[PDB]
Design a protein around this nucleic acid. Structure first.
Ligand SMILES: [Mg+2]
Ligand SMILES: [Zn+2]
Ligand SMILES: [Zn+2]
Lengths: 99, 90, 1342
DNA sequence: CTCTGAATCTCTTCCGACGCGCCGCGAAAA
RNA sequence: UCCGCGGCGCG
C-alpha cells in the first residue's frame, strides 16, 4: 500500500489510517526516538509539521514542490492547538508566553 | 555517485555544521539558479553540493564571505543606479 | 512565526473565562433534521460558534467575499471562515456555583490542604449532607465545624441568625473567600518553629508550601470553584453524519446535553421558589452530572449510555495510551508513506534498496507532477494526473530521473534501536515487494518471515541531506551500544567462506605451483583443480609505513586455491596472515573490523560488498546440503545407554533395600544420567569431527570431516554445539515447569523416533519458553519507554568542565576470575588525572586524554592496576554535560560532538537487550600467585594458624606484576593457613571456616571466668543428649525471667589469680558478652590460650524484573541494616518485638538508636566498634542506604556493576557509560539541610543544578551556601520531578501532573527534547542544535 | 490511668509494546 | 464513506 496525499481526519486534520480508506502509515514514538538519536532534527520537524499536521504549511509545501522549490515552511501543528483548547475546556488557563 | 561522506566530514570536522553548510549551498543552488563550482556529471544538486565541500573550495567561512560580497556588491550597484538617476534628474 | 518563549499554566478565573467565551448556550439541542441546521441557541449555534460554511451567512443574505467580517442583520451570524468553529469556545453559567472534580478528589486534596478540614467531611458536605459554619457572636460552637441537620435545627432555635451555616457547594467558595493567606503562612511558620513532632512538621510544611505557591503565583484560591463552565468548540466534537441522514454522537455532546438539561431545570426550579429539599436534590444531581462531564468515572459508578459503555469525559481524552498526547501529539500519521513485505535482493549494493515500481510512482507523484510541468508536457495539474494515471512511457523515464539520488527512510516496526531506521538510495524493481540488501537484515532484526516494513520519503533539501549524511547505511556501521560492527556476514555467506577456505589432503591438481591468484582462478574455473587443493602460490602484500605509504612485499607460500581466490577481493592494505585460516563467523568479523581499523571507510564498504558477492557465489557452487544420512549415530550409544540402564536399575534396588533415601537416590540418579550424557555427547562429537582419508601414497590419514552438519555448525552459520548434540545424541535432562528434573531421561534423538511419553515430556520446556518469550515483550517495551523518558533531556553542550573528581576503575573480579578486563572498561574514556608509571611518580598518561587503542596498549604494557576516569555522573555542567566526561563516541571513533543527544541513545541501548533477557567452608586458590589480605585485623592462634578479627575482610590473589586475579570474602573467625604475601599455587586451600556456625575468638590467653551466670535469668544448665557433655544455653530475652531480661551474661579474661586481663592497646578489660540462644561447653574459670575459640551459634530474581527494580530503586523486602555513625555498638533497653540497637560514637556527642526486628541475625557483635556505614546484617542493601551512607560514587559503581553483571550473565555486551548516564539522570533532585544565605527552606527538595548554581553565586558573593543531600528518586518519580511540566504530563499520571502544575502556576521553558517535539519546532539536538545556538545568542542579544 | 506520637493497616490510584490486517455493529430517540 | 467499541490473526 502507498498513500502519498489523500483524505484527512476531521477531528485533528491528521491523515487517516488503514488501506481500505487509503490512509497513511503511522510514525510512532519509536521512530521519533530513532530520529532523535541520529539527530536529523530537520527530518523530524518536516515529518511532524508538514507531512502530518500543519494545514497551512503542508499546502504551501505542496505548492513549493509543484513549483520545484524544496524549502521548509514550519508551522504550529493543529493537534497542539487541539490540546490547548481541550485543556482550556477543563477550567484551566493555558497560554503562550512572550507573544 | 557518492557512497559515503566521511571525507567531507573530515574536511568540516563536525557532521552537523557540514550538513547545515551543504544545505545552505544547495538551497542557494536550487532557487538562486547559481553555478556549480565542480563539473556536475548530470548529478542532482544535493550531491554536487556535497562534492564542492569534498573539494574543500567551500565551507562556512567561504560561504559567508561570498554571500557578504554579493550583498554589498548589490548595495553598491543600487547606489550607482541612484547616483545615475540623480545625475539624470539634476 | 509566533515564536512564543514558553508555556504558562494557571487557574481559570470566572471573569477571564467569561472573556474567553463568545457567549452562552441555552438549549440542549444540536441541529434540525428537516434542514440539517443548528438550533437557534444550541451547542452548534451559528451566532455563537460561527458560520456553517466558509464566508456564507446562515440565512444566505450575504454570499460574497466583500462581506468579510459582517454580522448579518437578518440572522446575526458573522461571515468568516469555518475555521473559527475550531477556535471559539462556548460557556455555561450554573444556577449554583459548582466545584472542580480534580482539585476536590485528586490526592492530596488541594482544597483540603488549603483548609484544615479532612477531605471526607468536606466532600460529604459538598454533596449536601451537612452544613458548614461561619461564626458570629458567642456560641460554644466555633467556626469551621461540621454540623448535621438536627444540630443545625437546635442551634437555629438556640441562636438564630447570630451564626451562619450553609449547605455545601456555595459554602465552600464562601469560606474560601474568607481567609488571608499571609497571616496563615506566618502563623504556620511560627508553629513550625514551635513544633517538635516530625509528622506534624511534615503536614504543616506541605500546607505552607502549597499556600505560599498560591501567594507567589497570584492566583486566587476562591477560583478553585467554578461558576462558569466552558464548552469545547463544536468542531472538536463533530456530530458524524451517517447513511440516510442519521448521525453518530460524539461522547462529549451527551455529557454536555445532560449538564444543560440539569442547569436549565435548576434555573426554572429556583424561579418557582420551591422548598429547599427539591432544589438541594436537583443541585446535587447537577454536581454529579458536572463531575461526570469533567472526569467521568473518578468517583462512583461512571454514567453510561445505552451501549452500556463507560462514557468518555474531557479528562479521559488526555490520559492514557489512546489519549491525545500519546496517540496524536507524538506519532502523527504521515503522508508519503508505504508499507510492503520484504524480499532478499542479492544483486544489490550495500546502500541501494529495491522498491516496487507502483509504490515509487505513488510516493513520488508530487515530483512527477513537478518535472512534468518542468518539461511542459502537462499544461495543467489535471493533465499531469491524467498522464500519470495513463502511465505514458515518458512518465517512467521521469520517474527514473527523479529518484536518481533521492534517499528514502526505511523502518521496520517496531523500532527497538537507532539502527532500526535506515536510509537507502532506491532503485526500481518489478513486483510488489521491497528488495533489501542481505547484510542489513541483521541490523533491522528482520528474518524474511513475511514481516512487513514501511517507507517514507524526505521532502526538504535539508532532510535529504540528513538522510544521505547521517542515516545512510554506509555510515553508522558500528552499533552505538558497543563498538562491535553490526554488518556481520552470517548463514549462507559464512558457509560459503568456510567451505571456500577449507582444505582437503587429497584433491585434483594438488602440489602444482601457480604464479598468482589470477591463474588460480583460471585453474579452478577450468575445473582442473578442486577448491580444497593445497598448493604453493606467489602472493604480494602491502603495509603502511611511518608515513602511511603502502610498502610492498611478495613471496611464495602454501595456500588452498580457494583462499588464493579470496585474495583477489581483499583491499590493498590487508596483511595476508589474517586470511590464512579456516574462516568462520568470528574470524570474518575480526577480518572486516581489521580492514575498518586499518583502511578507510570506502575500502571497508567495497570489501564488504565483494565478500558478500563472493560468499554467495561459492556457497552456490558448493552445493552443501543436508541429508538423512548425515546424522550418523555412534555405535557406542547403545552401549552407553545399556550401562546407564544398569546403573539406574541397581541404584533403584539399593533404594528399595533401604540403603539410601529418596532424595539421595534422586540426586545420584541425576548425576549418573548426566555423566552418561557427557560420555555419549563426547563420543558423538569425536565420531563426527574427523574423517578417514587417503594420501598421495595411498596411506591412511585423518582430516576434519566434511559431513554437512559438522561444517554447518562449526562455521557458526546458524548453529551451535547444543543443536547438533540434540540431533543425534542424547537430548538431555531438561526439567518440569516447576524446575524439577523428571528423573526419566529423554533417550532417543530426533533422527530416531521420540516416544509418545518422551516427546510429551519434551514439550513442557518448549511451551514454557514460548510463553515467556511472548510475554516478555510487554515489560521490555515498558521499561524502554520509562528509561527513554527519564533520559530524554540530556545533550552534550559544553566542550569541557573544569573539574577533577572522577570515577575509580579496576577490573571486576568475582569467583577468582576477571569478568571484564580493564582494557574494555576504560577504553574510550577521558583521563581524570595524570596516570603514573607503577612504582614511580613519573607521568605515564597525562590528564584529560582520550583512551584510544594505542594508549590502552601502553597502559597494558605498564600493567597498571587501577585508573581514574571522568564520568557523566561527576559532570559539573548545568542543564547538560561536557563532551569530555562522556568520552569517546562509539559510532564514530572520535570524541563526541556538541549537540548529540546521548540520553536517548543510552536509553535505547539499554532497551534493545531487554528483549534478550530471561526472567523465567573453605577456599581454593586457582592459579599461582601471591596471597594478599585486606580490610583485616588478624591474630595468630596457638595452633600456628591465622584468625580474622575484622569484618568485610577480603582475600586477593595478585600476580608479580601487581594485578589481582582472584578475590574472595573472608568469613569472621575463620582459620587462615597462609601468611600475607605468601606465594601459592593453583588448586591450593588457604583458609577454612564453618559455614553454619558463628564462633567467637579470644586474642589473649587467660582464665575465662563466667559473669552473670544465673539459671533461668541469663542461662540454663543442660546436658548434651548424644554425648552427655555439660553445657550452658543462653536464654532469650523473653525466654528468661523479667528480672534477668537486661542482665548480660559474659566471659571475662583474668589471670590465674583472677586479676583483670585488659584488651591489648586499651585499658578496658576483655569481656565478651553472650548472645541469646548461644551454647557453651566449657565451664566457669577455665584457662584458654591466645587466638582461642569457644562458641556455638547457629548461622533468585528473574532478569528483567531485576533490572527494572534496580533502575526503579525498589526497597527490598529484606533490607540489610547498616550502621549510621561510627562508634561502639551496644544493646539498649529491651523492646517489644524488636531489639534496641544503640551506637555510642567514639567521639560524637549524640548516641544513635534503632529498632531492629528480633528475628534478624545481626552480623556484628554487640561488643564491637563499627565504621560509618558498616554492615550490621545480611541481605540486599537498598540503594538509598548506599547513597546516604557511602556517597554517590559508591551508588554509581554499584548500579553499573549489578546491571552489567545481569547482561554479562546473559552475555550481551554494553558499555558502562550507558548505565552511568541513566544514573546521572536519576540523581536529579536534592534536599536541603541548611539554607544558608539562600532563599530556600530547610527540608525542601529542589533541582541539584539549581542548588549548585545558588551556592556558586552565594560564595561568589561571599555568603553562606546551602548544605544539601542528594536523594535517589526512582525513574518514575524522577520523571515526574522534571521542571518542565509538559514532559511529565506526556509521560504518565497526567491528571496529577496537570493539577499540580495548574495549582502552582509553573512556567515551562520547553527545554527538553520531548516538549520541543510536541511544540513542533526543531529539537535542541543534532542538526537543530546549531540553529538553537543561533537563537539563544540573539534572543539574549535582542 | 490518660494523652500524644509513631508506626502499621486499610483503602484508593495508576498501569502492563506496537504496528497493522480482518471482522461486525450502534438508537426511549425522534 | 470518513465516528466509536469489542473480538481474531500476522509480524
Ligand atoms: Mg519475525
Ligand atoms: Zn444572515
Ligand atoms: Zn564534565
Amino acid at each position: 500500500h502507498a498513500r502519498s496525499t489523500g483524505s484527512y481526519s476531521l477531528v485533528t486534520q491528521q491523515p487517516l489510517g488503514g488501506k481500505a480508506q487509503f490512509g497513511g502509515q503511522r510514525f510512532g514514538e519509536m521512530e521519533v526516538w530513532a530520529l532523535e538519536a541520529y539527530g536529523a532534527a530537520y527530518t523530524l520537524q518536516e515529518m511532524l509539521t508538514v507531512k502530518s499536521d500543519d494545514v497551512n504549511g503542508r499546502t504551501k509545501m505542496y505548492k513549493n514542490i509543484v513549483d520545484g522549490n524544496h524549502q521548509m515552511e514550519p508551522g504550529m501543528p493543529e493537534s497542539f492547538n487541539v490540546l490547548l483548547k481541550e485543556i482550556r475546556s477543563l477550567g484551566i488557563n493555558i497560554e503562550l508566553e512572550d507573544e | 555517485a557518492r557512497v559515503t561522506v566521511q571525507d567531507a566530514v573530515e574536511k568540516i570536522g563536525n557532521r552537523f555544521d557540514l550538513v547545515l553548510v551543504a544545505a545552505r549551498r544547495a538551497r542557494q543552488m536550487q532557487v538562486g539558479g547559481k553555478d556549480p563550482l565542480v563539473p556536475e556529471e548530470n548529478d542532482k544538486t544535493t550531491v554536487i553540493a556535497l562534492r564542492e565541500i569534498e573539494e574543500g573550495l567551500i565551507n562556512n567561512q567561504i560561504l559567508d564571505v561570498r554571500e557578504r560580497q554579493e550583498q554589498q556588491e548589490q548595495e553598491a550597484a543600487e547606489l550607482q543606479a541612484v547616483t545615475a538617476i540623480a545625475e539624470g534628474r539634476r | 512565526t509566533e515564536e512564543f518563549d514558553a508555556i504558562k499554566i494557571a487557574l481559570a478565573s470566572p471573569d477571564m473565562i467569561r472573556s474567553w467565551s463568545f457567549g452562552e448556550v441555552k438549549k440542549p439541542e444540536t441541529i434540525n433534521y428537516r434542514t440539517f441546521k443548528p438550533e437557534r441557541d444550541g451547542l452548534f449555534c451559528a451566532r455563537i460558534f460561527g458560520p456553517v460554511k466558509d464566508y456564507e451567512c446562515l440565512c444566505g443574505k450575504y454570499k460574497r467575499l466583500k462581506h468579510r467580517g459582517v454580522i448579518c442583520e437578518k440572522c446575526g451570524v458573522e461571515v468568516t471562515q469555518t475555521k473559527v468553529r475550531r477556535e471559539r469556545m462556548g460557556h455555561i453559567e450554573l444556577a449554583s456555583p459548582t466545584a472542580h472534580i480534580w482539585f476536590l478528589k485528586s490526592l492530596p486534596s488541594r482544597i483540603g490542604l488549603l483548609l484544615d478540614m479532612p477531605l471526607r467531611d468536606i466532600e460529604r458536605v459538598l454533596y449536601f449532607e451537612s452544613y458548614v459554619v461561619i461564626e458570629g457572636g458567642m456560641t460554644n460552637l466555633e467556626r469551621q465545624q461540621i454540623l448535621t441537620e438536627e444540630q443545625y435545627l437546635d442551634a437555629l432555635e438556640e441562636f438564630g441568625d447570630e451564626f451562619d451555616a450553609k449547605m455545601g457547594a456555595e459554602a465552600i467558595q464562601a469560606l474560601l473567600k474568607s481567609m488571608d493567606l499571609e497571616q496563615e503562612c506566618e502563623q504556620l511558620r511560627e508553629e513550625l518553629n514551635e513544633t517538635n513532632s516530625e509528622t506534624k512538621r511534615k503536614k504543616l510544611t506541605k500546607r505552607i508550601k502549597l499556600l505560599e505557591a498560591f501567594v507567589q503565583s497570584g492566583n486566587k484560591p476562591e477560583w478553585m470553584i467554578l461558576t462558569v463552565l466552558p464548552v469545547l468548540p463544536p468542531d472538536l466534537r463533530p456530530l458524524v453524519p451517517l447513511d440516510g441522514g442519521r448521525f453518530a454522537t460524539s461522547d462529549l455532546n451527551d455529557l454536555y446535553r445532560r449538564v444543560i438539561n440539569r442547569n436549565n431545570r435548576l434555573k426554572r426550579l429556583l424561579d418557582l421558589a420551591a422548598p429547599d429539599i427539591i432544589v438541594r436534590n436537583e443541585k446535587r444531581m447537577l454536581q454529579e452530572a458536572v463531575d461526570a462531564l469533567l472526569d467521568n468515572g473518578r468517583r462512583g459508578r461512571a454514567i453510561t449510555g445505552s451501549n452500556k459503555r463507560p462514557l468518555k469525559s474531557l479528562a479521559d481524552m488526555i490520559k492514557g495510551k489512546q489519549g491525545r498526547f500519546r496517540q496524536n501529539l507524538l506519532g502523527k500519521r504521515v503522508d508519503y508513506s508505504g508499507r510492503s513485505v520484504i524480499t532478499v535482493g542479492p544483486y544489490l549494493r550495500l546502500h541501494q534498496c529495491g522498491l516496487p515500481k507502483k509504490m515509487a510512482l505513488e510516493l513520488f507523484k508530487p515530483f512527477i507532477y513537478g518535472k512534468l510541468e518542468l518539461r511542459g508536457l502537462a499544461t495543467t495539474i489535471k493533465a499531469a494526473k491524467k498522464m500519470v494515471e495513463r502511465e505514458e512511457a515518458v512518465v517512467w523515464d521521469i520517474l527514473d530521473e527523479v529518484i536518481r539520488e533521492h534517499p528514502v527512510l526505511l523502518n521496520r516496526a517496531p523500532t527497538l534501536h537507532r539502527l532500526g531506521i535506515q536510509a537507502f538510495e532506491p532503485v526500481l524493481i518489478e513486483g510488489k515487494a521491497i528488495q533489501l540488501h542481505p547484510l542489513v537484515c541483521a541490523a533491522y532484526n528482520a528474518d524474511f518471515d513475511g514481516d512487513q516494513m514501511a517507507v517514507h520519503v524526505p521532502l526538504t533539501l535539508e532532510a535529504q541531506l540528513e538522510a544521505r549524511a547521517l542515516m545512510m547505511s554506509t555510515n553508522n556501521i558500528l552499533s552505538p551500544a558497543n563498538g562491535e560492527p553490526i554488518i556481520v556476514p552470517s548463514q549462507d555467506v559464512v558457509l560459503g567462506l568456510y567451505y571456500m577456505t577449507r582444505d582437503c589432503v587429497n584433491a585434483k591438481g594438488e602440489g602444482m605451483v601457480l604464479t598468482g591468484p589470477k591463474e588460480a582462478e583460471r585453474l579452478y574455473r577450468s575445473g582442473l583443480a578442486s577448491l580444497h587443493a593445497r598448493v604453493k602460490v606467489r602472493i604480494t602484500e602491502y603495509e603502511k609505513d611511518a608515513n602511511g605509504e603502502l610498502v610492498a612485499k611478495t613471496s611464495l607460500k602454501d595456500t588452498t586455491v580457494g583462499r588464493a581466490i579470496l585474495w583477489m577481493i581483499v583491499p590493498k592494505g590487508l596483511p595476508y596472515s589474517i586470511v590464512n585460516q579456516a574462516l568462520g563467523k568470528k574470524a570474518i568479523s575480526k577480518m572486516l573490523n581489521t580492514c575498518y581499523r586499518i583502511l578507510g571507510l570506502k575500502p571497508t564498504v567495497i570489501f564488504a560488498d565483494q565478500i558478500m558477492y563472493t560468499g554467495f557465489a561459492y556457497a552456490a557452487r558448493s552445493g552443501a546440503s543436508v541429508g538423512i544420512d548425515d546424522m550418523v549415530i555412534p555405535e557406542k550409544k547403545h552401549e552407553i545407554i545399556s550401562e546407564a540402564e544398569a546403573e539406574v536399575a541397581e541404584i533403584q534396588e539399593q533404594f528399595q533395600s533401604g540403603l539410601v533415601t529418596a532424595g539421595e537416590r534422586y540426586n545420584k540418579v541425576i548425576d549418573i544420567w548426566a555423566a552418561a550424557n557427557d560420555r555419549v555427547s563426547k563420543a558423538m562429537m569425536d565420531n563426527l569431527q574427523t574423517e578417514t582419508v587417503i594420501n598421495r601414497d595411498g596411506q591412511e590419514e585423518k582430516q576434519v570431516s566434511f559431513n554437512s552438519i559438522y561444517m554447518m555448525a562449526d562455521s557458526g552459520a546458524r548453529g551451535s554445539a547444543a543443536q547438533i548434540r540434540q540431533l543425534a545424541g542424547m537430548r538431555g535432562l531438561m526439567a518440569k515447569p516447576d524446575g524439577s528434573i523428571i528423573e526419566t531421561p529423554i533417550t532417543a534423538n530426533f533422527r530416531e523416533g521420540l516416544n509418545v511419553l518422551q516427546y510429551f515430556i519434551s514439550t513442557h520446556g518448549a511451551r514454557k519458553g514460548l510463553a515467556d518469550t511472548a510475554l516478555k515483550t510487554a515489560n521490555s517495551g515498558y521499561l524502554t519507554r520509562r528509561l527513554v523518558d527519564v533520559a530524554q533531556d540530556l545533550v552534550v553542550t559544553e566542550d569541557d568542565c573544569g573539574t577533577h573528581e572522577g570515577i575509580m576503575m579496576t577490573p571486576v573480579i568475582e569467583g577468582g576470575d576477571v569478568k571484564e578486563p580493564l582494557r574494555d572498561r576504560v577504553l574510550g574514556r577521558v583521563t581524570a588525572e595524570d596516570v603514573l608509571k607503577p612504582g614511580t611518580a613519573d607521568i605515564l598518561v597525562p590528564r584529560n586524554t582520550l583512551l584510544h587503542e594505542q594508549w590502552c596498549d601502553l597502559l597494558e604494557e605498564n600493567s597498571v592496576d587501577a585508573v581514574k576516569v571522568r564520568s557523566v555522573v561527576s559532570c559539573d555542567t548545568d542543564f547538560g554535560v561536557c563532551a569530555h566526561c562522556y568520552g569517546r563516541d562509539l559510532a564514530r571513533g572520535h570524541i563526541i560532538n556538541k549537540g548529540e543527544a546521548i540520553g536517548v541513545i543510552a536509553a535505547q541501548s539499554i532497551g534493545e537487550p531487554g528483549t534478550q533477557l530471561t526472567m523465567r567452608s573453605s577456599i581454593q586458590v586457582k592459579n599461582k600467585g601471591s596471597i594478599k589480605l585486606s580490610n583485616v585485623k588478624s591474630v595468630v592462634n596457638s595452633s600456628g594458624k591465622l584468625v580474622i578479627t575484622s569484618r568485610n575482610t577480603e582475600l586477593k590473589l595478585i600476580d608479580e606484576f601487581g594485578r589481582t586475579k582472584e578475590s574472595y570474602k573472608v568469613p569472621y573467625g575463620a582459620v587462615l593457613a597462609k601468611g600475607d604475601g605468601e606465594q601459592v599455587a593453583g588448586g591450593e586451600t588457604v583458609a577454612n571456616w564453618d559455614p553454619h556456625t558463628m564462633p567467637v575468638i579470644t586474642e589473649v590467653s587467660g582464665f575465662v571466668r563466667f559473669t552473670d551466670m544465673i539459671d533461668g535469668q541469663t542461662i540454663t544448665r543442660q546436658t548434651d543428649e548424644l554425648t552427655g557433655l555439660s553445657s550452658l544455653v543462653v536464654l532469650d530475652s523473653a525466654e528468661r525471667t523479667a528480672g534477668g531480661k537486661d542482665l548480660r551474661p559474659a566471659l571475662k579474661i583474668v589471670d590465674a589469680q583472677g586479676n583483670d586481663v585488659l584488651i591489648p592497646g586499651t585499658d578496658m578489660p576483655a569481656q565478651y558478652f553472650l548472645p541469646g540462644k548461644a551454647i557453651v561447653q566449657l565451664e566457669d574459670g577455665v584457662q584458654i590460650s591466645s587466638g582461642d575459640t569457644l562458641a556455638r551459634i547457629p548461622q533468585i530474581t528473574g532478569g528483567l524484573p531485576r533490572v527494572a527494580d534496580l533502575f526503579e530503586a525498589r526497597r527490598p523486602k529484606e533490607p540489610a541494616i547498616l550502621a549510621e555513625i561510627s562508634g561502639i555498638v551496644s544493646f539498649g533497653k529491651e523492646t517489644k518485638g524488636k531489639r534496641r540497637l544503640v551506637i555510642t560514637p567514639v567521639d560524637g556527642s549524640d548516641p544513635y538508636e534503632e529498632m531492629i526486628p528480633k528475628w534478624r541475625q545481626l552480623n556484628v557483635f554487640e561488643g564491637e566498634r563499627v565504621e560509618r556505614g558498616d554492615v550490621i546484617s545480611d541481605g540486599p542493601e537498598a540503594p538509598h542506604d548506599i547513597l546516604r551512607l557511602r556517597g554517590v560514587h559508591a551508588v554509581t559503581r554499584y548500579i553499573v556493576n549489578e546491571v552489567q553483571d545481569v547482561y554479562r550473565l546473559q552475555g550481551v555486551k554494553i558499555n558502562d557509560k550507558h548505565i552511568e548516564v541513566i544514573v546521572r539522570q536519576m540523581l536529579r533532585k536534592a534536599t536541603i539541610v541548611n539554607a544558608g544565605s539562600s532563599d530556600f527552606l530547610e527540608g525542601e527538595q529542589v533541582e541539584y543544578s539549581r542548588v549548585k548554581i545558588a551556592n556558586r553565586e552565594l560564595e561568589a558573593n561571599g555568603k553562606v551556601g546551602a548544605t544539601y543531600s542528594r536523594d535517589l528518586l526512582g525513574i518514575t518519580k524522577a520523571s515526574l520531578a522534571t521542571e518542565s511540566f509538559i514532559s511529565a504530563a506526556s509521560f504518565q499520571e497526567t491528571t496529577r501532573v496537570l493539577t499540580e502544575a495548574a495549582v502552582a502556576g509553573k512556567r515551562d521553558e520547553l527545554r527538553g527534547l520531548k516538549e520541543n517535539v510536541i511544540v513542533g519546532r526543531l529539537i535542541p539536538a543534532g542538526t537543530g542544535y546549531a540553529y538553537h545556538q543561533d537563537r539563544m545568542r540573539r534572543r539574549a542579544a535582542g
